């Protein structure tokens, strides 16, 4: 799940067809769980501060169930998409927090998606 | 370079043909810079300790030139290959250190390889 999510989020950022996989189809379905307004806000703040700061703050919120975990994946993916490839983001810092919060749900998320 | 190296190292770990790209061909050439004995030792220690600890210790060594930077990429790649996909490694912790050391050489590494 760690490798899959890294690959997915990075592909959402750059849109390189050579790095696409059908495994992503099921993960892209998680987008319905997230309100486009929350993403829009997060992007505005990231641009206002010229940093990944607002994203790292979003990812630090508690994850109490599988639905919270799915929303975190979706928010990261939608943010990656909407921020653009030119954005100088140390993605590994975001993955560190994301996986710290969602790690436990990996087994169940895999079952849920596939 | 950050995205490319993440993608390369993860592909070296699982050998998933669906996640392969021809950009990796030039990076795989860096393997000649690394002695297989150093990798063998690193793997032995990682298994002895049941941790990525030895790898994170290797990556914390100073990088004084582009050749040091290339050796770090090659050691990470050969370790990723030899440790196996089943290995529960928090890859983002390794990428954090690797990129902290090699970040500056990215522009020059890109020129050197492509």
Residue numbers in the entry:
A (entry chain E), B (entry chain B): 1 to 114
Per the authors:
VACV protein N1 is an intracellular virulence factor that is expressed early during infection and modulates innate immunity by at least two strategies: preventing apoptosis and inhibiting NF-κB activation. Biochemical and structural analysis of these mutants demonstrates that the anti-apoptotic activity of N1 relies on a hydrophobic groove on the surface of the protein and that the anti-NF-κB activity requires an intact dimer interface.
To determine if the point mutations introduced in N1 generated unanticipated structural changes, R58Y, Q61Y and R71Y N1 were expressed in bacteria, purified to homogeneity and their structures determined at 3.0–3.1 Å resolution. For both the R58Y and Q61Y mutants, the tyrosine residue protruded into the groove in a manner likely to reduce BH3 peptide binding. While WT N1 and the groove-filling mutants (R58Y, Q61Y, R71Y) were all dimeric, the I6E mutant was almost exclusively monomeric. Introduction of the groove-filling mutations R58Y and Q61Y abolished the ability of N1 to prevent apoptosis, while mutants R71Y and I6E inhibited STS-induced apoptosis as strongly as WT N1. Investigation of N1 mutant R58Y binding to Bid and Bad was unsuccessful because this mutant bound strongly to all proteins examined, including both pro-apoptotic and anti-apoptotic Bcl-2 proteins and tubulin, for unknown reasons (data not shown). However, infection with vN1.R58Y or vN1.R71Y induced lesions that were indistinguishable from vN1.WT. Considering that R58Y N1 was no longer anti-apoptotic and I6E N1 no longer displayed anti-NF-κB activity, our results indicate that suppression of the N1 anti-apoptotic activity does not significantly attenuate VACV virulence whilst suppression of NF-κB activation does.
